[PDB]
Amino acid sequence: ACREWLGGCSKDADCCAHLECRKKWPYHCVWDATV
């Protein structure tokens, strides 16, 4: 359905959830910052 931690974010919101989009290509979802 969506990408999880270290998947492939297309949105900085969280792709799946509780995440953010890495600004480093290739963009993968990481745990926001210090969540």
Count how many Cα atoms sit within 13 Å of the Cα of residue 33 in the half-sphere of its side chain.
3
H or E segment and range at residue 29: strand 29-30
Residue 20 is assigned to a structural domain of this protein: yes
Tell me how far CA of residue 19 lies from CA of 1, 28, 34, in angstroms.
15, 10, 10
C-beta of residue 10 within 8 angstroms of C-beta of residue 22: no
Residue 13 is assigned to a structural domain of this protein: yes
Which residues sit opposite 29 in a β-bridge?
21
Name the structure determination technique.
Answer: NMR
**Structural domain harbouring 6:** 1-29
Rg (alpha carbons) of the chain, rounded to whole number: 8
Q: Give the burial string for 3-28 (b: 16+ CB within 10 Å, else e).
A: bbeeeebeeeebbeeebbbeeeeebb
Which residues sit opposite 21 in a β-bridge?
29
Total domains, the chain: 1
C-beta of residue 4 within 8 angstroms of C-beta of residue 21: no
- Kindly compute the dihedral angle of the four CA atoms of residues 11, 15, 21, 25, in this order, to the nearest 10 degrees: -90
